């Protein structure tokens, strides 16, 4: 799209006559491409003459429009400071009239109407300032784009555009800060939240509502998913066979359910960030022009939910009666992976390719610098470890447990489980669960070796490394219970000895390094930090309590399982707790990204 159509789409005609006429230069460039001769048509010396002309005429035209853009941004910055002076005098007059209502009622009612009217006045003035940054940054991007199209110029953009007064003058940016500092101290008399609520203008080309077609698709997918889920519940209640164990099916489909729930919660998270003002575009280093809003994620979440409901429903009662049952769980995940890769330039190709790059960089953790996106994804994998181990179990079941001859082999004939796949034997289960905590450990050590700062890159390393010992002790306990040694219970102690640590280690951390709460300076925000982006502190306290509970939720599992001795209690509690784990990650994302935006806690961009 070459930053040509969407650029004109988000261009206001009011200043369009003096923006970088990118479309006009496109027309000139293609039209003069149409008259490119060959070696025989014009001699090589004349070819060099033609190319030298082309390049120098393009560069002098660029110089002319460069001078035009500098002239406009100089006059408009003089206008911006003149408007600063005028609006400052008007706000001083409003403050004097406030003193006429404070230090010395129809008059007071008129004065607060005037206060709100000037509030709207600096709102549209902030909009004009946003238009001026549009001028600046879109001019920069158009310069780069047209010049690199000509090149396909570099020392020209650097030696003209990067030093031109139309981008070297970052004061307009801090002028926006003035518009901030003028408001909060004078308009709101010290209220930051209402300021950022009113004056902060969402981008017209990015934060605009998504097309009604995408919202309709989201609604259609959500409705189909709801009805399919209801039909699935009824099918389980009635049409499901009660004489066969349904555990392999649950274990196979628990990963897909956890992934779809995660995508839906991530859509909610990105909506929350966008509304609260946390510019995750900069934090994630995403493309400012085109990015996935919350609806574009709800769409994929609903589509995959429909896909999972249909697959599970076909697994419940066979519709074809000639196709074996296991084909549905195989095909669902197979074409989910296909949709993930999808080499063709369709179905969110930009975001899918970006995610594929991120996954490749994360998985090969030690040999790559850790950005915020990489750390964030390798942390998200920590709470989605159930998906990885469930995929491992599905592979094991399809390899060494499933009977390919029997059509209804997915649901075992017997109601008892004795296969190797769901056991901790050989340590395979232990290893596939420690993968997410291995990537984070390696990434933390890489950050330490890249910044030579022992803190917090080494405390993070210990926090991530506790799970190694915890899982190892759990595996030893399971094996020694299988064999029945005297040391068995001893290993159990070590599990509980380390588990209560590996939760506390990830509980004093989530509340202090990630969420930044319990700050030394609190003031009005009890137990919180100085600045709270989100509206109500009740959300903050609910998040604290929820994380405190969910980091120890394993206590309930280890309490019921070791006491009640139900026919099948461990699997039930694990399957119940996995969605709670994903919910905990969803809650954590809000406050982690907010703190990263505010205090730059990760020291990523510095």
Ligand X SMILES: CC(C)CCC[C@@H](C)[C@H]1CC[C@H]2[C@@H]3CC=C4C[C@@H](O)CC[C@]4(C)[C@H]3CC[C@]12C
Binding site as annotated, residues for phosphate? 379, 382, 463-464, 551, 584-585
CA distance 260 to 125: 43
Q: Smallest gap, in angstroms, from Cβ of residue 312 to ligand X? A: 13
Question: Using an 8 Å Cβ cutoff, are 146 and 22 in contact?
Answer: yes
- Smallest separation, CB 109 to ligand 3PE (Å): 32
Convert 355-369 to b/e letters by CB count within 10 Å (16 or more is b): eeebeebbeebeeee
Choose the binding region for a copy of itself from 140-148, 173-181, 227-235, 506-514 (rule: CB under 8 A): 227-235
Residue 472's binding partner out of ligand X, a copy of itself, ligand 3PE, none, with CB under 5 to 8 Å set by partner kind: ligand X
Q: Does 399 bind ligand X (CB under 6 A)?
A: yes
8 A C-beta contact, residue 282 and residue 377:
no
Among 213, 238, 367, 455, binds ligand PLM (CB under 6 A): 213
Q: Which is nearer to a copy of itself, 27 or 96 (CB)?
A: 27
- Return the exposure string of 68-86: e unless at least 16 CB atoms fall within 10 Å of the residue's CB, then b: bbbebbeebbeebeebbee
* Cβ proximity of 465 and 441 under 8 Å: yes
Q: Considering CB distances under 5 to 8 angstroms, the limit depending on partner class, which of ligand 3PE, ligand X, ligand PLM, none binds residue 445?
A: none
Q: How far is the CB of 219 from ligand 3PE (least distance, A)?
A: 7
**Six token digits for residue 36:** 């490119």
Question: What helix, strand, coil percent values describe the chain, rounded to 5?
Answer: 75, 0, 25
- Minimum CB–partner distance for residue 542 and ligand X (Å): 4
The answer to the question of residue 251 lying near ligand IHP (CB under 6 A) is no
Spatial separation of the C-alpha atoms in residues 365 and 354, rounded to whole Å: 17
Which of 384, 421, 475, 593 is the binder for ligand X (CB under 6 A)? Answer: 475
Q: Which is nearer to a copy of itself, 91 or 528 (CB)?
A: 91
590 lines the binding site for ligand X (CB under 6 A): yes
Q: Quote the Cα angle for 108-113-115, to 5°.
A: 90
In whole angstroms, how far apart are CA 197 and each of 180, 266, 539, 575? 12, 23, 18, 41
Find the shortest distance in angstroms from Cβ 111 to ligand X. Answer: 32
Does residue 1 belong to the site contacting ligand IHP (CB under 6 A)?
yes
Pick what 330 binds: ligand 3PE, a copy of itself, ligand PLM, none; C-beta below 5 to 8 Å, kind-dependent. Answer: none
Q: Which of 19, 65, 72, 149 binds ligand IHP (CB under 6 A)?
A: 149
Q: Is 563 exposed, middle or buried (0-12, 13-18, 19+ CB in 10 A)?
A: exposed
| 604 vs 28: CA distance, rounded Å | 43
Whether the CB-CB separation of 451 and 457 falls below 8 Å is answered with yes
Report the Cα 53 to chain-centroid distance in Å.
47
CB of 546 to ligand X, least distance (A): 4
Please, which residue, 146 or 434, has the CB nearer to ligand X? 434
Restricting to residues 497-556, which ones interact with ligand X according to CB under 6 A?
500, 534, 539, 542-543, 545-546, 549, 552, 555
Residues 6+ away with beta carbon under 8 Å from 114: 94, 97
Annotated binding site: 379, 382, 463-464, 551, 584-585
Which one-letter DSSP state was computed for residue 206?
T
DSSP 381: H
Under the binding rule (CB under 6 A), the answer on residue 348 touching ligand IHP is no
The alpha carbon dihedral of 354, 359, 362, 367 has a sign of: negative
**Which CB atom, from 213 or from 367, has the smaller least distance to ligand PLM?**
213
Minimum gap (Å) between residue 274 Cβ and ligand 3PE: 7
Question: Contact positions toward ligand IHP, by CB under 6 A?
Answer: 1-3, 145, 149
Question: Contact positions toward ligand X, by CB under 6 A?
Answer: 234, 272, 275-276, 319-321, 330, 333-334, 337, 391, 395, 398-399, 427, 430-431, 434, 465, 468, 471-472, 475-476, 479, 496, 500, 534, 539, 542-543, 545-546, 549, 552, 555, 558-559, 562, 587, 590
Question: Contact positions toward ligand PLM, by CB under 6 A?
Answer: 211, 213-214, 217
Question: Contact positions toward a copy of itself, by CB under 8 A?
Answer: 13, 27, 31, 106, 109, 113, 120, 124, 209-210, 212, 215-228, 231, 295
């Amino acid at each position: 799209m070459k930053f040509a159509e969407h650029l004109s789409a988000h261009i206001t005609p009011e200043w369009r006559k003096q923006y970088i006429q990118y479309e006009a230069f496109k027309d000139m460039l293609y039209s003069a491409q149409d008259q490119a001769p060959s070696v025989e048509v014009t001699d090589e010396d004349t070819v060099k003459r033609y190319f030298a002309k082309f390049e120098e005429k393009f560069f002098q035209t660029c110089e002319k429009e460069l001078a035009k853009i500098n002239t406009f941004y100089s006059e408009k910055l003089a206008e911006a400071q003149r408007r600063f002076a005028t609006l400052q005098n008007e706000l001083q007059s409003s403050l004097d009239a406030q003193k006429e209502s404070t230090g010395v009622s129809h008059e007071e009612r008129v004065q607060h109407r005037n206060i709100k009217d000037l509030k709207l006045a600096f709102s549209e003035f902030y909009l004009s300032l946003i238009l001026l940054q549009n001028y600046q940054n879109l001019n920069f991007t158009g310069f780069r784009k047209i010049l690199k199209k000509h090149d396909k110029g570099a020392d020209w953009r650097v030696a003209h555009v990067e030093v031109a007064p139309f981008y070297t003058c970052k004061k307009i940016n801090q002028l926006i800060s003035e518009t901030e500092a003028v408001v909060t101290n004078e308009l709101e008399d010290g209220d930051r939240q209402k300021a950022m609520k009113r004056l902060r203008v969402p981008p017209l080309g990015a934060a605009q509502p998504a097309p009604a077609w995408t919202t309709f698709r989201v609604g259609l997918f959500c409705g189909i998913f709801i009805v399919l889920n209801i039909t699935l519940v009824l099918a389980a209640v009635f049409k499901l066979e009660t004489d066969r164990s349904i555990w392999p099916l649950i274990r196979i489909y628990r990963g897909g359910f956890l992934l779809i729930e995660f995508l839906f919660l991530l859509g909610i998270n990105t909506y929350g960030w966008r509304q609260a003002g946390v510019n995750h575009v900069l934090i994630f280093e995403l493309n400012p022009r085109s990015n996935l809003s919350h609806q574009h994620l709800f769409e994929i979440a609903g589509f995959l939910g429909i896909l999972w409901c249909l697959s599970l429903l076909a697994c419940f009662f066979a519709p074809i009666s000639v196709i074996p049952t296991y084909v549905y769980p195989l095909a669902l995940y197979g074409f989910m992976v296909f949709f993930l890769i999808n080499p063709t330039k369709t179905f969110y190709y930009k975001s899918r390719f970006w995610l594929l790059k991120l996954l490749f960089r994360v998985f090969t953790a030690p040999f790559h610098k850790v950005g915020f996106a990489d750390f964030w994804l390798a942390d998200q994998l920590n709470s989605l470890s159930v998906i990885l181990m469930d995929l491992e179990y599905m592979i094991c079941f399809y390899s060494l447990e499933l009977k390919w001859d029997e059509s209804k082999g997915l649901l075992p004939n017997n109601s008892e489980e004795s296969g190797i796949c769901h056991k901790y034997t050989y340590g395979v289960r232990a290893i596939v669960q420690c993968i997410p905590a291995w990537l984070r450990f390696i990434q933390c050590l890489r950050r330490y070796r890249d910044t030579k700062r022992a803190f917090p890159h080494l405390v993070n390393a210990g926090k991530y490394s506790t799970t190694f010992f915890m899982v190892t002790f759990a595996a030893l306990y399971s094996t020694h219970k299988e064999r029945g040694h005297s040391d068995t219970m001893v290993f159990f102690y070590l599990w509980i000895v380390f588990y209560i640590i590996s939760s506390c280690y990830t509980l004093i951390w989530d509340l202090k390094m990630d969420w930044g709460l319990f700050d030394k300076n609190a003031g009005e925000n009890t137990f919180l930090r100085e600045e709270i982006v989100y509206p109500q502190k009740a959300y903050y306290y609910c998040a604290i309590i929820e994380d405190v509970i969910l980091r120890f939720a394993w206590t309930i599992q280890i309490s019921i399982t070791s006491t009640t001795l139900l026919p099948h209690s461990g699997d039930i509690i694990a399957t119940v707790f996995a969605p709670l784990e994903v919910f905990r990650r969803f809650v954590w994302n809000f406050f982690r990204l907010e703190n990263e935006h505010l205090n730059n806690c990760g020291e990523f961009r510095a």
